[PDB]
Design a protein around this nucleic acid. Structure first.
Ligand code: MG
Ligand code: MG
Ligand code: MG
Ligand code: MG
Ligand code: MG
Ligand code: MG
Ligand code: MG
Ligand code: MG
Ligand code: MG
Ligand code: MG
Ligand code: MG
Ligand code: MG
Ligand code: MG
Ligand code: MG
Ligand code: MG
Ligand code: MG
Ligand code: MG
Ligand code: MG
Ligand code: MG
Ligand code: MG
Ligand code: MG
Ligand code: MG
Ligand code: MG
Ligand code: MG
Ligand code: MG
Ligand code: MG
Ligand code: MG
Ligand code: MG
Ligand code: MG
Ligand code: MG
Ligand code: MG
Ligand code: MG
Ligand code: MG
Ligand code: MG
Ligand code: MG
Ligand code: MG
Ligand code: MG
Ligand code: MG
Ligand code: MG
Ligand code: MG
Ligand code: MG
Ligand code: MG
Ligand code: MG
Ligand code: MG
Ligand code: MG
Ligand code: MG
Ligand code: MG
Ligand code: MG
Ligand code: MG
Ligand code: MG
Ligand code: MG
Ligand code: MG
Ligand code: MG
Ligand code: MG
Ligand code: MG
Ligand code: MG
Ligand code: MG
Ligand code: MG
Ligand code: MG
Ligand code: MG
Ligand code: MG
Ligand code: MG
Ligand code: MG
Ligand code: MG
Ligand code: MG
Ligand code: MG
Ligand code: MG
Ligand code: MG
Ligand code: MG
Ligand code: MG
Ligand code: MG
Ligand code: MG
Ligand code: MG
Ligand code: MG
Ligand code: MG
Ligand code: MG
Ligand code: MG
Ligand code: MG
Ligand code: MG
Ligand code: MG
Ligand code: MG
Ligand code: MG
Ligand code: MG
Ligand code: MG
Ligand code: MG
Ligand code: MG
Ligand code: MG
Ligand code: MG
Ligand code: MG
Ligand code: MG
Ligand code: MG
Ligand code: MG
Ligand code: MG
Ligand code: MG
Ligand code: MG
Ligand code: MG
Ligand code: MG
Ligand code: MG
Ligand code: MG
Ligand code: MG
Ligand code: MG
Ligand code: MG
Ligand code: MG
Ligand code: MG
Ligand code: MG
Ligand code: MG
Ligand code: MG
Ligand code: MG
Ligand code: MG
Ligand code: MG
Ligand code: MG
Ligand code: MG
Ligand code: MG
Ligand code: MG
Ligand code: MG
Ligand code: MG
Ligand code: MG
Ligand code: MG
Ligand code: MG
Ligand code: MG
Ligand code: MG
Ligand code: MG
Ligand code: MG
Ligand code: MG
Ligand code: MG
Ligand code: MG
Ligand code: MG
Ligand code: MG
Ligand code: MG
Ligand code: MG
Ligand code: MG
Ligand code: MG
Ligand code: MG
Ligand code: MG
Ligand code: MG
Ligand code: MG
Ligand code: MG
Ligand code: MG
Ligand code: MG
Ligand code: MG
Ligand code: MG
Ligand code: MG
Ligand code: MG
Ligand code: MG
Ligand code: MG
Ligand code: MG
Ligand code: MG
Ligand code: MG
Ligand code: MG
Ligand code: MG
Ligand code: MG
Ligand code: MG
Ligand code: MG
Ligand code: MG
Ligand code: MG
Ligand code: MG
Ligand code: MG
Ligand code: MG
Ligand code: MG
Ligand code: MG
Ligand code: MG
Ligand code: MG
Ligand code: MG
Ligand code: MG
Ligand code: MG
Ligand code: MG
Ligand code: MG
Ligand code: MG
Ligand code: MG
Ligand code: MG
Ligand code: MG
Ligand code: MG
Ligand code: MG
Ligand code: MG
Ligand code: MG
Ligand code: MG
Ligand code: MG
Ligand code: MG
Ligand code: MG
Ligand code: MG
Ligand code: MG
Ligand code: MG
Ligand code: MG
Ligand code: MG
Ligand code: MG
Ligand code: MG
Ligand code: MG
Ligand code: MG
Ligand code: MG
Ligand code: MG
Ligand code: MG
Ligand code: MG
Ligand code: MG
Ligand code: MG
Ligand code: MG
Ligand code: MG
Ligand code: MG
Ligand code: MG
Ligand code: MG
Ligand code: MG
Ligand code: MG
Ligand code: MG
Ligand code: MG
Ligand code: MG
Ligand code: MG
Ligand code: MG
Ligand code: MG
Ligand code: MG
Ligand code: MG
Ligand code: MG
Ligand code: MG
Ligand code: MG
Ligand code: MG
Ligand code: MG
Ligand code: MG
Ligand code: MG
Ligand code: MG
Ligand code: MG
Ligand code: MG
Ligand code: MG
Ligand code: MG
Ligand code: MG
Ligand code: MG
Ligand code: MG
Ligand code: MG
Ligand code: MG
Ligand code: MG
Ligand code: MG
Ligand code: MG
Ligand code: MG
Ligand code: MG
Ligand code: MG
Ligand code: MG
Ligand code: MG
Ligand code: MG
Ligand code: MG
Ligand code: MG
Ligand code: MG
Ligand code: MG
Ligand code: MG
Ligand code: MG
Ligand code: MG
Ligand code: MG
Ligand code: MG
Ligand code: MG
Ligand code: MG
Lengths: 97, 146
RNA sequence: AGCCGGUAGCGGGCGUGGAUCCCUGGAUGUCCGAAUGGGGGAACCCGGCCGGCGGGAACGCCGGUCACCGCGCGCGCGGGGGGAACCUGGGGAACUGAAACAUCUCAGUACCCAGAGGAGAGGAAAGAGAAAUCGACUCCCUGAGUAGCGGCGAGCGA
RNA sequence: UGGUUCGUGGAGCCAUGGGGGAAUCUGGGCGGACCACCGCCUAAGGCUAAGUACUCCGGGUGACCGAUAGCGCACCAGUAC
RNA sequence: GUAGGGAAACCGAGUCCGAACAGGGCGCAGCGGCCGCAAAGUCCGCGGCCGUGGACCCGAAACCGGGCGAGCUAGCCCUGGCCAGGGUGAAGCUGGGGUGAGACCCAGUGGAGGCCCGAACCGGUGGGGGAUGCAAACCCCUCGGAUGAGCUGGGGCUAGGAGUGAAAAGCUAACCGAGCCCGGAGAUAGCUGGUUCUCCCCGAAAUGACUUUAGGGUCAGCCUCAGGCG
RNA sequence: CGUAGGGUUAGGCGGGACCUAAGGUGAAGCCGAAAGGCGUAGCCGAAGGGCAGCCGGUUAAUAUUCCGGCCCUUCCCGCAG
RNA sequence: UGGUGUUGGCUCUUGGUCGCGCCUGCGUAGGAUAGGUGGGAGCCUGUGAACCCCCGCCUCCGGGUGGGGGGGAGGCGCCGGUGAAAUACCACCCUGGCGCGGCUGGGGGCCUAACCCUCGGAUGGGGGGACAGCGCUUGGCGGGCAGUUUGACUGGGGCGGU
RNA sequence: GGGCCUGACUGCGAGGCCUGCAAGCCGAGCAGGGGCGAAAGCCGGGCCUAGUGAACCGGUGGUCCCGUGUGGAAGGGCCAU
RNA sequence: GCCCGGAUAGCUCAGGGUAGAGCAGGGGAUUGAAAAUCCCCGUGUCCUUGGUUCGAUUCCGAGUCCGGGCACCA
């Protein structure tokens, strides 16, 4: 899952820490680390289809910024849009950011 | 997710009212079918801009009717006809009552807005009903004479 | 006042009417190469359009123009590739040390990638931290192997 | 999860992949869990010389080498092979 | 450096443990006639040794990163080529026989097959030779397959914990139980080897305790030098 | 082998200005931290398809190439049907 | 594999806490169906009584009760008899039931519009369908793979012994 | 064998044994508050030599020593186990 | 160390107003018996100690023993 086109959220590198033992605060000797290795945390990317000036535009977006898509659809009502292709439309909708 | 209904909808609300729905129902159903719009702030005052006009435009329709109920309830359109003892040879229609008003008092009147189902064939004093705007009706005193 | 590079000789020339030679600007600059008309096993092969040359229409040569991508109202402008180290960002080992070994160490180092520029990063407090105080950021000394962190081991370290 | 001296520790701070999701100064963040009090500072927009680094390049200088040394190459060397 | 004691608050030539004025721990105090010399300490130089660094020099078998190889070899893909000559004689067909019709029988024809013999071609069984070779796998005699799961040219694809494998851990450019090159890198080596002028004095140990320790270490023992005591 | 001089002649032979095969590449499109990985048509890709020359003579050295004899292909323009 | 996001519409029937309703509560003595306690000689009835019918009903099968169609001057308490606890009316509540309202969670039936597949026709038709896929998080199986560990003494080492 | 009892003490400890270290062992006497004995005196477990495990990490009772601007708190320290 | 359990007759298991039931054991009926079957019969501090109530299997508390489960191990 690549990149949110609205927020620019992208996959980040994380660790995955494996622990044994009873935490000190529960009365145990404490926690011991039995493995640390690398992994990727991904943005929850989804498709959002909307029709703008009679053209289907598809966004790859983190579920965080889903309502931001419709916001740009509003702000495009003052724009002169008809005649352009679904590519040029998406460009305009994004420069409003 | 509050949105603005643009159509009365089954167990949601009346057009112009703002109600709450789950997001999926909104952005995947109500919105692409024109059935509503999201209740942003931009098209929120836009809604207050319409309830404002309609309030004042409907009150002007009530205020102009009064600027004629005052007149018409303070006068007598007198219609001289040709008649024998009681019954007229011709008749006086709303059209006649209309043009006769424009003749004497010069008030312009819509004859189709006058409560006359049968043309008038008998001398006397009549008080009829004039409804320019409903719930604001006028009682016109009109004297027909030979 | 000599000169036609190393480089002498053969055979021929130039210079006080200022050469050779040294500096700056300019002109020329085959083909390949980011390579960019298109193709291709780099330095080869094959085209469109405009103008020219030959007896020239076929054929060939000469000059000009023609890639992709981005950005602004078909026209412009910009991008590409390279550069000894140095710099920022995105990824990121292991031997080794712990006299075995896994947490820890080596080290965010080696290396890969993107980008930058003569530097780059950073930078004008939602800061510091106890001074009733200071007053952007960067770099050097000191603070200090301190405070602390640590299978409280080996070590790490403001 | 990462960063910091901080390896889960009483673990704050800065950064953020997921979920929930505010207010405009009588708003908000910080002073190492947390609460009070007392103070510090104004987040989610951008730019900014100089002092810093390096040495393909040019010059100056060595209690630097002197042809098995000094650069791999003093010489037609990143060559012959 | 000039004050230490205590985990600390803290006190201070003291302090901590303690109820203590108890007891104990760790601490506290120049030579000569105000002048001079010496000295705590500290600064710089020199020397021995220790810590961190590759740390006396040379040497692994290996681990890891980024690249380079399928012109050798293995499999597959696309497109071409090659297999003298001879021998055997399946099915089917035709005719004859047979029967109620058949099954089936004989003859002829026919030309099948991981069929047979044997060159080219592809192999490499036994023996001998070669063994600083003609050759880092060859030569001679002999022997297997030779229409097939056949052999072979040109164009291609698949690679390093990965390929490919009628399976041998085979092969992946003349050593593959994990290729090659450059890099981390002077990896690490408690092991083995090596360690360069002269003279003078002294002079060991191969034991004990503990040790994932036993051919390695830490302390003690034994050697040496300096200052002091006598 | 050393030094010098000379020698390779094509519309028809082979390849190109022709076609496609595996495969490679790749406007559309799809995917991946970056580098990049895919991908229909299209383009490239040959010892496969396609396409018009045979015999003799000559040089120290080239010959279906030069020469001789006899044949043929495509492109342009013109005339005729 | 649970929670959650992407993720929506309509129903059916549930359950768990919270507020209120109305009661269910029958060992033995006894009038009879005695929750626990306390208050209290008056609660009632035209602001519908002593009897007939539907039943919500729960019945311990003896009885409890409501709202309806019955109904046009009547009830039961103090008194008590035996009680550990007197009965009426009123209330604070326990063990329990459900009528209603709150958040809720659970399953089940359907739908289409997200998302997925398909359709020479693609702002559309068809099928799957809020499942699947994909994101963050939970626990588990996991030599397919990775990093490693697998002691010493020893009349050689192993085995044995220590 | 019996009576009374809890010294199977608290705060310390001259001086020694043993010994590479670290440990192990024996100890008179002073103070607090006690048991027994008329008293002298004895008693800091057991005739004696085996019946044991350094540190790290954490639990529990106490102490009120530290408490990250300040008052608390979180968390440590100390004594005991 | 923490939560959930149990104990009831000889073995097993059921349980605010009872002390239960089955199997083992006793005789009696029954056959050639080995039986099944039929019968009647016993076997309790319900672990113990406080408390609850008018009362105690229950309910509470607290200890004893034995079951389960959880986490831990310097
Ligand atoms: Mg994790
Ligand atoms: Mg605690
Ligand atoms: Mg841990
Ligand atoms: Mg830890
Ligand atoms: Mg990993
Ligand atoms: Mg998507
Ligand atoms: Mg969507
Ligand atoms: Mg749509
Ligand atoms: Mg979010
Ligand atoms: Mg959200
Ligand atoms: Mg913004
Ligand atoms: Mg008329
Ligand atoms: Mg000359
Ligand atoms: Mg000359
Ligand atoms: Mg002159
Ligand atoms: Mg001049
Ligand atoms: Mg020039
Ligand atoms: Mg080009
Ligand atoms: Mg090209
Ligand atoms: Mg031209
Ligand atoms: Mg000419
Ligand atoms: Mg021309
Ligand atoms: Mg040309
Ligand atoms: Mg051109
Ligand atoms: Mg590039
Ligand atoms: Mg550049
Ligand atoms: Mg860097
Ligand atoms: Mg970085
Ligand atoms: Mg790696
Ligand atoms: Mg590591
Ligand atoms: Mg390691
Ligand atoms: Mg290792
Ligand atoms: Mg090291
Ligand atoms: Mg090691
Ligand atoms: Mg080691
Ligand atoms: Mg090892
Ligand atoms: Mg290691
Ligand atoms: Mg590590
Ligand atoms: Mg290192
Ligand atoms: Mg590190
Ligand atoms: Mg980096
Ligand atoms: Mg480097
Ligand atoms: Mg500068
Ligand atoms: Mg700068
Ligand atoms: Mg500012
Ligand atoms: Mg300020
Ligand atoms: Mg600062
Ligand atoms: Mg100030
Ligand atoms: Mg300033
Ligand atoms: Mg510093
Ligand atoms: Mg200091
Ligand atoms: Mg640390
Ligand atoms: Mg460390
Ligand atoms: Mg660290
Ligand atoms: Mg570090
Ligand atoms: Mg820092
Ligand atoms: Mg850190
Ligand atoms: Mg952290
Ligand atoms: Mg960390
Ligand atoms: Mg922290
Ligand atoms: Mg924050
Ligand atoms: Mg967040
Ligand atoms: Mg405001
Ligand atoms: Mg404020
Ligand atoms: Mg506020
Ligand atoms: Mg903040
Ligand atoms: Mg602060
Ligand atoms: Mg805070
Ligand atoms: Mg604070
Ligand atoms: Mg501040
Ligand atoms: Mg600011
Ligand atoms: Mg900031
Ligand atoms: Mg800048
Ligand atoms: Mg300036
Ligand atoms: Mg600067
Ligand atoms: Mg330098
Ligand atoms: Mg220089
Ligand atoms: Mg120089
Ligand atoms: Mg010299
Ligand atoms: Mg030399
Ligand atoms: Mg040299
Ligand atoms: Mg020499
Ligand atoms: Mg030398
Ligand atoms: Mg050089
Ligand atoms: Mg050399
Ligand atoms: Mg050089
Ligand atoms: Mg040399
Ligand atoms: Mg050379
Ligand atoms: Mg101290
Ligand atoms: Mg004290
Ligand atoms: Mg004292
Ligand atoms: Mg003392
Ligand atoms: Mg001195
Ligand atoms: Mg020495
Ligand atoms: Mg030393
Ligand atoms: Mg080294
Ligand atoms: Mg080093
Ligand atoms: Mg070394
Ligand atoms: Mg050294
Ligand atoms: Mg390794
Ligand atoms: Mg390994
Ligand atoms: Mg590699
Ligand atoms: Mg390669
Ligand atoms: Mg091959
Ligand atoms: Mg090959
Ligand atoms: Mg073929
Ligand atoms: Mg053959
Ligand atoms: Mg044949
Ligand atoms: Mg044959
Ligand atoms: Mg044959
Ligand atoms: Mg024969
Ligand atoms: Mg024969
Ligand atoms: Mg035959
Ligand atoms: Mg035939
Ligand atoms: Mg036959
Ligand atoms: Mg024949
Ligand atoms: Mg045959
Ligand atoms: Mg055969
Ligand atoms: Mg044969
Ligand atoms: Mg054969
Ligand atoms: Mg055979
Ligand atoms: Mg061969
Ligand atoms: Mg052989
Ligand atoms: Mg062979
Ligand atoms: Mg033989
Ligand atoms: Mg042999
Ligand atoms: Mg050999
Ligand atoms: Mg041979
Ligand atoms: Mg032979
Ligand atoms: Mg032979
Ligand atoms: Mg043979
Ligand atoms: Mg044979
Ligand atoms: Mg043969
Ligand atoms: Mg054969
Ligand atoms: Mg044959
Ligand atoms: Mg074949
Ligand atoms: Mg082949
Ligand atoms: Mg082939
Ligand atoms: Mg071949
Ligand atoms: Mg090939
Ligand atoms: Mg393959
Ligand atoms: Mg491959
Ligand atoms: Mg490998
Ligand atoms: Mg590798
Ligand atoms: Mg494999
Ligand atoms: Mg094979
Ligand atoms: Mg090789
Ligand atoms: Mg090789
Ligand atoms: Mg090989
Ligand atoms: Mg091998
Ligand atoms: Mg290996
Ligand atoms: Mg390996
Ligand atoms: Mg190897
Ligand atoms: Mg090889
Ligand atoms: Mg090689
Ligand atoms: Mg390299
Ligand atoms: Mg390097
Ligand atoms: Mg290293
Ligand atoms: Mg080395
Ligand atoms: Mg090693
Ligand atoms: Mg060794
Ligand atoms: Mg030696
Ligand atoms: Mg001496
Ligand atoms: Mg001697
Ligand atoms: Mg000895
Ligand atoms: Mg010894
Ligand atoms: Mg040991
Ligand atoms: Mg050993
Ligand atoms: Mg041994
Ligand atoms: Mg050993
Ligand atoms: Mg050794
Ligand atoms: Mg020693
Ligand atoms: Mg001695
Ligand atoms: Mg001696
Ligand atoms: Mg000595
Ligand atoms: Mg001496
Ligand atoms: Mg002496
Ligand atoms: Mg020659
Ligand atoms: Mg020639
Ligand atoms: Mg010709
Ligand atoms: Mg052409
Ligand atoms: Mg083509
Ligand atoms: Mg594209
Ligand atoms: Mg990736
Ligand atoms: Mg590409
Ligand atoms: Mg590609
Ligand atoms: Mg393709
Ligand atoms: Mg073409
Ligand atoms: Mg082509
Ligand atoms: Mg190609
Ligand atoms: Mg081609
Ligand atoms: Mg061809
Ligand atoms: Mg063909
Ligand atoms: Mg051909
Ligand atoms: Mg041809
Ligand atoms: Mg011909
Ligand atoms: Mg000639
Ligand atoms: Mg020839
Ligand atoms: Mg010829
Ligand atoms: Mg000719
Ligand atoms: Mg014509
Ligand atoms: Mg999951
Ligand atoms: Mg869901
Ligand atoms: Mg359905
Ligand atoms: Mg649909
Ligand atoms: Mg569709
Ligand atoms: Mg559809
Ligand atoms: Mg559909
Ligand atoms: Mg459907
Ligand atoms: Mg459904
Ligand atoms: Mg789902
Ligand atoms: Mg979760
Ligand atoms: Mg997991
Ligand atoms: Mg396993
Ligand atoms: Mg393994
Ligand atoms: Mg598996
Ligand atoms: Mg393996
Ligand atoms: Mg071990
Ligand atoms: Mg051994
Ligand atoms: Mg031995
Ligand atoms: Mg032995
Ligand atoms: Mg022995
Ligand atoms: Mg022996
Ligand atoms: Mg022996
Ligand atoms: Mg053994
Ligand atoms: Mg006694
Ligand atoms: Mg007494
Ligand atoms: Mg002593
Ligand atoms: Mg000792
Ligand atoms: Mg002992
Ligand atoms: Mg005493
Ligand atoms: Mg006494
Ligand atoms: Mg006494
Ligand atoms: Mg006494
Ligand atoms: Mg004593
Ligand atoms: Mg210990
Ligand atoms: Mg430790
Ligand atoms: Mg501790
Ligand atoms: Mg405590
Ligand atoms: Mg305090
Ligand atoms: Mg504080
Ligand atoms: Mg306070
Ligand atoms: Mg305080
Ligand atoms: Mg504490
Ligand atoms: Mg504590
Ligand atoms: Mg505390």
């Amino acid at each position: 899952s690549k990149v949110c086109e609205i927020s620019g959220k992208r996959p980040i590198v994380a660790n995955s820490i494996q622990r044994r033992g009873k935490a000190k605060r529960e009365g145990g000797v404490g926690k011991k680390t039995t493995g640390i290795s690398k992994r990727r945390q991904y943005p929850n990317l989804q498709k959002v289809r909307v029709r703008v000036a009679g053209q289907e535009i598809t966004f790859r977006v983190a579920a965080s910024h889903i309502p931001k898509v419709y916001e740009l659809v509003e702000r495009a009502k003052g724009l002169k849009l008809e005649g352009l292709s679904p590519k040029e439309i998406k460009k305009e909708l994004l420069k409003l950011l | 997710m509050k949105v603005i209904l643009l159509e009365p909808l089954e167990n949601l609300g009346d057009v112009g009212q703002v109600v709450d729905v789950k997001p999926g129902y909104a952005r995947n159903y109500l919105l692409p079918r024109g059935l509503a719009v999201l209740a942003t702030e931009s098209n929120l005052k836009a809604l207050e801009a319409r309830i404002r006009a309609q309030a004042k435009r409907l009150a002007e329709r009530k205020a102009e009717a009064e600027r004629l109920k005052e007149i018409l309830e303070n006068l007598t359109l007198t219609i001289p006809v040709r008649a024998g003892e009681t019954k007229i040879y011709g008749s006086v229609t709303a059209k006649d009552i209309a043009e006769a008003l424009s003749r004497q008092h010069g008030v312009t009147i819509d004859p189709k807005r006058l409560a006359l189902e049968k043309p008038i064939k008998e001398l006397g004093e009549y008080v009829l009903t004039y409804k320019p705007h409903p719930e604001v009706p006028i009682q016109l005193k009109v004297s027909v004479v030979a």
